[PDB]
RNA sequence: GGCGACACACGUGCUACAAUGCCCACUACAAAGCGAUGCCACCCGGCAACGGGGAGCUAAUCGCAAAAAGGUGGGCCCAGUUCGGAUUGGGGUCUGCAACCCGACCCCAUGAAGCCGGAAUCGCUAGUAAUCGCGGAUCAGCCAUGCCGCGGUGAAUACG
RNA sequence: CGCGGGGUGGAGCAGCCUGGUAGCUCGUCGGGCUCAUAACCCGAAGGUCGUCGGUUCAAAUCCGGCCCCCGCAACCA
RNA sequence: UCGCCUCCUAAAAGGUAACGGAGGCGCCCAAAGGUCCCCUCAGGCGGGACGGAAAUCCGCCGGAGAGCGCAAGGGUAGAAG
């Protein structure tokens, strides 16, 4: 485990053309990807024995790393559960990890998406780094669909080395991200 | 029986033949 | 100890190109992906 | 349920075809809805009838081996 | 005897059995028993080590089945959360998609009996 | 476009719930009716509705068109099933300018409720009831489980 | 305290010694019979059988044990 | 109304009155306790499938306005959380 396509195609195509596209000097100025944060949470978890570890478990196989069993802060009197103990799930995925997920996002789970059209045209405005919306889920090139007890949507965010917009918008812009335009 | 549209009493019923009733 | 594995894979596409990556389960059948596009069909 | 042809008449693409031959606007009424989706077509806007009025129905890349009609409803509270 | 899904008929003539699996109809089964000139009346409890694989070879590996097949079909019904088939609604809307009668039937598409009836006539 | 709507309602009926049954194969026995831009024998192509060719038939003379329930053999062994086919996905045919709203078939796949029906209620006095197949009118086609006819097998009971 | 006895549809009350049904009504909803209405007449929504622990093939029920009511007789530094 | 805890009244020490002004207590917790090892907020403004106007996210700016069983108040992330 130690070489993609992405991580690479980063390296030999995305390296040298950011650097000589906005003009840095040194390797690390250049802005690069850094991390995904990508989470779930449902907060479908609730009355009539509600568990859902599966709902974690099953995100597992398509992320590789064993989610998070998050909480939430207050109380929702205006909707169920309260003060901690409920439901909210993450997976933090970091290099490798990250790559590979990465990867075969940009090659399957990109038009199974039901139709498709393009990724949002802006999402990470302003404050450098961008998250997405997610709906479905069996999209991926796993997580069979004669197995799938329910469709939950999910958040990937996507952190970077980018300062701006324009540079996190390249880094994807030029590695394998498709924008609606 | 006389519905299924896949036995020899029921082409029959239903007035007609196919693969479930020869048309001899 | 509680993980989803991994493997090298070798994924073939609906079309024709087939990516040598890795992630879990060898063989996966994919409908359609990248060598795939921008295949449009024109505007009146 | 054809086998030889598209029931889609022809009031619509000595119109749909010529608008074709430059890739204008959209807006083109017509009561043809008893017609077939055709191949292309696909980012223009019918107006299809329902006995009422016109119909602002787009038209996507998955709508062609179905007909007009099957997106103009005609009784209303569906 | 697995085969397909967790699916496992025994007990009875195999050109039956077939029929259990979900995408095995009548029609189907009794070819997969000519077309690998394996025998109908045979039970599924005596069944060659080989047969039996021998079988879900030709088998699982064509017509896709049971699972790859079930929500396969939702596939092209959600396809129909497009801009709006009349189709669409009725799966959307829960009620019979085959230019049927409402007015009266369509009991299957219908929870059975949703009664909340009123209607006054004329007292004095 | 609508009369086809649909949270519901009653009336008339179709298919069933199964072993006195169902399936596949074979094999007998009708009567009544209708047939010219009609009914299509008969070869051919598709596991098929159907398509190509093509003989006859103004029809007691050629056809629809073979009757089904019987019989005979084989398959099922009491299960929501090889019962029952509703709904749903798919691929197709003919018609007709045209079948989304709105056809019928065929074919692959799903196989739903129903394991005998509350109070109540309907029919029938014998070639009847019951159950089985066949026709025609209207018709381009058909939503025909209707309607008007036909013929097959063939009970029970009536003290009062 | 102790002997009892008692809680089960929205209120009412049987199922309590017998194990094997979750019901009998009032009341809302339909649907029945008339010439229509009334009146009778049916089928349903609805209850952790209070609670939990338990033996059984199975529990409202027999066992447990406690919260809780009401009768009494008694206790109150 | 009658014992008790908090604040004001109460005049910068303490206390200090009214049938003064305004709230609580008659419980809880075998982890909500010993301890040792880890960790950090509330909000605001962007960015986000269900998404209020605060769910769970991501990114900045934000030392305390969050929390601490419960009344208020003292106190507190250099931890009591």
Redesign the pocket.
């Given at each position: 485990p130690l070489d993609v396509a992405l991580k690479r195609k980063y390296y030999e195509e995305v390296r040298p053309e950011l650097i000589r596209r906005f003009g840095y000097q040194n390797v690390w100025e250049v802005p690069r990807l850094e991390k995904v944060?990508?989470?779930?949470?449902?907060?479908?978890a609730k009355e009539d024995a509600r568990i859902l570890e599966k709902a974690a478990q099953e995100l597992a196989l398509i992320t590789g790393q064993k989610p998070a069993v998050?909480?939430?802060?207050?109380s929702?009197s205006?909707?169920?559960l309260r003060?901690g103990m409920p439901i909210?799930?993450?997976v933090?995925l970091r290099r490798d990890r990250m790559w590979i997920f990465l990867e075969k996002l940009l090659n399957v789970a990109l038009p199974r998406i039901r139709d498709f059209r393009g990724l949002?045209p802006?999402?990470?405005?302003?404050?450098?780094?961008?998250?997405?919306?997610?709906?479905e889920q069996l999209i991926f090139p796993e997580i069979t669909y004669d197995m799938v007890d329910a469709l939950?949507?999910?958040?990937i965010?996507v952190?970077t080395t980018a300062e701006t917009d324009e540079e996190a918008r390249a880094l994807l812009e030029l590695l394998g991200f498709p924008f609606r335009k | 029986?006389?519905?299924?549209?896949?036995?020899?009493?029921?082409?029959?019923?239903?007035?007609?033949?196919?693969?479930?009733?020869?048309?001899? | 100890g509680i993980h989803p594995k991994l493997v090298p894979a070798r994924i073939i596409c609906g079309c024709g190109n087939v990516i040598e990556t890795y992630s879990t389960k060898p063989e996966i059948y994919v409908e359609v992906c990248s060598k795939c596009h921008p295949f449009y069909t024109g505007q009146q | 349920?054809?086998?030889?042809?598209?029931?889609v008449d022809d009031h619509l693409l000595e119109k749909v075809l010529e608008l074709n031959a430059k890739g204008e606007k959209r807006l083109i009424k017509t009561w043809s809805?008893?017609?077939?989706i055709v191949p292309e077509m696909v980012g223009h806007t019918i107006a299809v009838?329902?006995?009422?009025q016109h119909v602002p129905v787009y038209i996507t890349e998955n709508m062609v081996?179905?007909?007009l009609?099957?997106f103009?409803?005609?009784?209303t509270?569906? | 005897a697995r085969i397909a899904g967790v699916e496992i008929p025994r007990?009875?003539?195999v050109?039956?059995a077939l029929?259990?699996?979900?995408?095995?109809?009548?029609?189907?089964?009794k070819?997969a028993l000519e077309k690998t000139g394996i025998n109908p009346?045979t039970r599924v409890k005596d069944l060659t080590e080989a047969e039996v694989v021998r079988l879900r070879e030709y088998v699982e590996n064509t017509?896709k089945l049971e699972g790859e097949?079930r929500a396969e079909?939702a596939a092209?019904?959600k396809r129909?959360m497009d801009i709006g088939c009349?189709?669409g609604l009725?799966?959307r809307?829960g009620?019979?998609?085959?230019?049927?009668?409402?007015?009266?039937?369509?009991?299957?598409?219908?929870?059975?009996?949703?009664?909340?009836?009123?209607?006054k006539?004329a007292?004095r």
């Open positions: 944060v990508i989470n779930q949470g449902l907060g479908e998050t909480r939430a802060k207050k929702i205006n909707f169920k003060k909210g799930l993450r933090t949002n802006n999402s990470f405005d302003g404050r450098g780094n961008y998250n997405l919306g997610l709906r939950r949507g999910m958040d965010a952190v | 029986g006389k519905g299924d549209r896949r036995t020899r009493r029921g082409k029959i019923w239903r007035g007609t033949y196919g693969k479930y009733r020869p048309r001899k | - | 349920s054809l086998k030889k042809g598209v029931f809805r008893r017609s077939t009838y329902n006995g009422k081996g179905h007909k009609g099957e103009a409803p005609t009784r509270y569906r | 007990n009875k003539r050109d039956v029929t259990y699996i979900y995408g095995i109809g009548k029609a189907r089964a070819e009346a017509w097949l079909v092209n019904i129909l009349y189709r009725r799966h809307r009620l019979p998609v085959r230019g049927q009668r409402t007015r009266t039937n369509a009991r299957t598409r219908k929870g059975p009996r949703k009664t909340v009836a009123g209607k006539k007292p």
